[PDB]
Amino acid sequence: MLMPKKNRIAIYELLFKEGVMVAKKDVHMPKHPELADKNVPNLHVMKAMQSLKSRGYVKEQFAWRHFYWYLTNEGIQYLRDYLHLPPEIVPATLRRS
Amino acid sequence: KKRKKKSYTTPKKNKHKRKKVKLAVLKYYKVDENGKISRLRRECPSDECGAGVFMASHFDRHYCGKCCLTYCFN
Amino acid sequence: GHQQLYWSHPRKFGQGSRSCRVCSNRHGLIRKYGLNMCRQCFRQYAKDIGFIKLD
Amino acid sequence: LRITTRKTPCGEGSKTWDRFQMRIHKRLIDLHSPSEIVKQITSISIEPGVEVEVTIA
Amino acid sequence: VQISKKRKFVADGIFKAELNEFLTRELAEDGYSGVEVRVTPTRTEIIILATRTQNVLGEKGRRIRELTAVVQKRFGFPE
Amino acid sequence: FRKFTYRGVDLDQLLDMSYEQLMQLYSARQRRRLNRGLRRKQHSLLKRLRKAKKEAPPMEKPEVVKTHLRDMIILPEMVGSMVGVYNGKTFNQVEIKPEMIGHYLGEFSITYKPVKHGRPGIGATH
RNA sequence: CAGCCACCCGAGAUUGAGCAAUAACAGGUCUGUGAUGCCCUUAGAUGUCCGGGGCUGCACGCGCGCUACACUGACUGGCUCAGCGUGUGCCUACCCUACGCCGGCAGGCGCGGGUAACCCGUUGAACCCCAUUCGUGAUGGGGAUCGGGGAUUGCAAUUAUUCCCCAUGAACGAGGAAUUCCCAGUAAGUGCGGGUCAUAAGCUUGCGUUGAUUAAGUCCCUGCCCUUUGUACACACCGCCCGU
RNA sequence: AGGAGUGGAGCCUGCGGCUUAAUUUGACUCAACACGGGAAACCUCACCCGGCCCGGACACGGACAGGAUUGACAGAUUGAUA
Ligand SMILES: [Mg+2]
Ligand SMILES: [Mg+2]
Ligand SMILES: [Zn+2]
Ligand SMILES: [Zn+2]
């Protein structure tokens, strides 16, 4: 989609921050609840996430009007390059244990 | 189930094609021979519309394009 | 502009403002007790919800 | 809680209805105790499915 | 605020149903059989019964953590 | 025969009256509608009607302005205006006459063709 | 014997539902679904918003129903009894209402309670009961149709959402051939709740309230089971098959 | 055996026919026809007349520091502050 660069950037920092992202399948709600205060429409989240899935960077699941996306290793590398993060920065899902 | 056959209502509305203009030379005017740039267009008086943005000059009125602020010639 | 027109019709009370929380359909919806599911989805999930047949 | 629905996913056939049911049972216990002893009694690994609410009058 | 007992029970049944459906769609390949929700003070334990527990957990637990986060994000439990 | 009169008051005072005074002459409904307020695109139609009336040459009818709105027939400000009301597929031409005050535009653009019956066929009587 | 009938004692001597086999139907549903395979379409789109129409349109035919044709009734006052239950919402706007005041009314304005055995509520239901006027006729039966006003919900009420008032006052005098459902707190009268619901029940799903006539049987009608019997059927009588 | 009926009236509703720009359509014996929880003003919505939008991922080539995105006014809307 045509979206502002800051919107895609914020979506990517969220996704890299916890490695997962959920979103209601509703193109008309004006603010993503997690991405509020940054003015990111839910439609932008869904379309950016589908772009990443098509490129093979996330895995998507759907159940009861909700998308769930999990970051893949190739997605982790791509997002690290895209946001320029230090190699030692890793998503929350890879931590603990 | 039949075809639209909507040839009665218009012959396909043309979409808009933006005319290609080369550069923003007409906005600034150094050419003072003494490196004195003169701005050939007004600038906007809005907060988020500082020195960078300018305002168009039609046959009348001044128009911003960013905040859509208009000052008629009068 | 399209920004002010897209989805501009008020949707606050009618059947166009309610839908199934499972399948997003708008027909045969059960609003009682806050279920907000259509009849068929309710028959599908009734045992999971806790509604069981006695009489 | 009662919900009566048509059995069919369509509108065909003899009109049969499912009569679903949920039953909520409610118990009240009043006791004279300090709050610490009440906390000791309440947290005794109660059986799952039972909601317990302790209120101070 | 607070809601009625009827609505609260219907709501937690709805939550259980949606959770079970999502877990089915996610872990059918790993022998998913059911989910048990245990509510304790300030904690909610979700027990997933599966034949292949290692596949459900994933390597170093990664998969399970993902699931937890997803639940955390979907049903709005406190972080 | 006699000059037009609406609820006892005639054309000129109807023009000279405000909306608050209109609500008294109007019936229940067309009073609720005015009290709730004429929204936009009703003022747009009113101002288009005003412009068409003003630009009209002397002794000649105003040009017909077309609209989708089943709107109030407001005080004679709309009387004499030539309006094409959309019926669903056509803009039917209607001239606003003083007796039409207090009515809806849709009352003058019928949305269906009146039925002229044909011979029964097929399983009319099983 | 299996059991059947009657009677005593007894709260009760058959409460009502739910679930329900083998096997089958080219029964219904792709219009419930992020259930679906194949086609079709996919940017002047069969995707999706947004105006306006429609879905109601009316010579006529056919189903389910509501209100009646009155006096075992209408009207007007008076009196006095329920049960099932639902109430403030993820998105989500929209709850149930006591009390005070204003207005015939429908309503309006202030104030509180209630997330409910806590408030509405002691749910002051209707029929029914008591008294009144009418007086056998389309009558004060009955309320279709239609006019003029007033409110409410909504973003818009016109093709009239709903409600109120005053007017208007149609057929209908118990219904032909032909048919439905019913065995006891039952049929039938009578209201009340839930669903639908911004606005809303002549529908449906439940609840009480008043409360019977008749029957305790039979294959006569209608089916549907068997059993014996016949078949040239076996895609099974919507079969098979003969001749010009 | 009977009870309440209805088939007759008026109205309300569903179905056919007729009509229509369109009157979206599924389901015609029991086993369709106050059924699709189907009481449609908008929405719903499928149908008809008009008009915006892409919410045409991604891969491969073009174009590109100007690819492309909004937009106030007047026209125009053969309805609109599209
Ligand atoms: Mg027989
Ligand atoms: Mg043979
Ligand atoms: Zn500016
Ligand atoms: Zn559903």
UniProtKB/Swiss-Prot annotation, chain A:
The modification Phosphotyrosine is found at Y12. One of its GO terms (molecular function) is structural constituent of ribosome. Component of the small ribosomal subunit. The methylated form interacts with NPM1. GO terms for cellular component: cytoplasm; cytosol; cytosolic ribosome; cytosolic small ribosomal subunit; focal adhesion; membrane; nucleolus; nucleoplasm. It is found in: Cytoplasm; Nucleus, Nucleolus. Its main location: cytoplasm. Component of the 40S ribosomal subunit. The ribosome is a large ribonucleoprotein complex responsible for the synthesis of proteins in the cell. Belongs to the eukaryotic ribosomal protein eS10 family. The keyword Transcription regulation does not apply. The gene is RPS10. It comes from the Eukaryota. Methylated by PRMT5. Methylation is necessary for its interaction with NPS1, its localization in the granular component (GC) region of the nucleolus, for the proper assembly of ribosomes, protein synthesis and optimal cell proliferation. GO terms for biological process: cytoplasmic translation; translation. The chain holds residues 1 to 97 of 165 of the full protein. This is Small ribosomal subunit protein eS10. Keywords: Cytoplasm, Diamond-Blackfan anemia, Isopeptide bond, Methylation, Nucleus, Phosphoprotein, Ribonucleoprotein, Ribosomal protein, Ubl conjugation.
Curated annotation (Swiss-Prot), chain B:
It is found in: Cytoplasm; Nucleus, Nucleolus. Residues 1-18 are annotated as: Disordered. Signal peptide: none annotated. Transmembrane segments: none annotated. The modification N6-acetyllysine is found at K27, K36. There is a cross-link at K30, K36 (Glycyl lysine isopeptide (Lys-Gly) (interchain with G-Cter in ubiquitin)). Monoubiquitinated at Lys-30 and Lys-36 by RNF25 in response to ribosome collisions (ribosome stalling): ubiquitination promotes subsequent activation of RNF14, leading to EEF1A1 ubiquitination and degradation and rescue of stalled ribosomes. Deubiquitination at Lys-36 by USP16 is required for maturation of the 40S ribosomal complex. Coiled coil: none annotated. Changing K30R: Abolished monoubiquitination by RNF25, leading to impaired ability to rescue stalled ribosomes. It comes from the Eukaryota. Part of the 40S ribosomal subunit. Part of the small subunit (SSU) processome, composed of more than 70 proteins and the RNA chaperone small nucleolar RNA (snoRNA) U3. This is Small ribosomal subunit protein eS31.
Curated annotation (Swiss-Prot), chain D:
It is found in: Cytoplasm. It comes from the Eukaryota. The modification N6-acetyllysine is found at K15. The modification Phosphoserine is found at S33. Polyubiquitinated by ZNF598 via 'Lys-63'-linked ubiquitin chains when a ribosome has stalled, initiating the ribosome quality control (RQC) pathway to degrade the potentially detrimental aberrant nascent polypeptide. Deubiquitinated by OTUD3 and USP21, antagonizing ZNF598 activity. Coiled coil: none annotated. Component of the small ribosomal subunit. The ribosome is a large ribonucleoprotein complex responsible for the synthesis of proteins in the cell. Component of the 40S small ribosomal subunit. Belongs to the universal ribosomal protein uS10 family. This is Small ribosomal subunit protein uS10. It comes from Homo sapiens (Human).
UniProtKB/Swiss-Prot annotation, chain F:
One of its GO terms (molecular function) is RNA binding. There is a cross-link at K97 (Glycyl lysine isopeptide (Lys-Gly) (interchain with G-Cter in SUMO2)). Keywords: Acetylation, Cytoplasm, Isopeptide bond, Ribonucleoprotein, Ribosomal protein, Ubl conjugation. The keyword Cytoplasm applies. It holds the Pfam family Ribosomal_S19. GO terms for biological process: cytoplasmic translation; liver regeneration; osteoblast differentiation; positive regulation of signal transduction by p53 class mediator; ribosomal small subunit assembly; ribosomal small subunit biogenesis; ribosomal small subunit export from nucleus; rRNA processing. GO terms for cellular component: cytoplasm; cytosol; cytosolic ribosome; cytosolic small ribosomal subunit; focal adhesion; membrane; nucleoplasm; nucleus. Its main location: cytoplasm. It is found in: Cytoplasm. PANTHER family: RIBOSOMAL PROTEIN S19P FAMILY MEMBER (PTHR11880), SMALL RIBOSOMAL SUBUNIT PROTEIN US19 (PTHR11880:SF2). Component of the small ribosomal subunit. NCBIfam families: PRK04038.1, uS19_arch. Component of the small ribosomal subunit. The ribosome is a large ribonucleoprotein complex responsible for the synthesis of proteins in the cell. Belongs to the universal ribosomal protein uS19 family. This is Small ribosomal subunit protein uS19. It comes from Homo sapiens. The lineage of its organism: Eukaryota, Metazoa, Chordata, Craniata, Vertebrata.
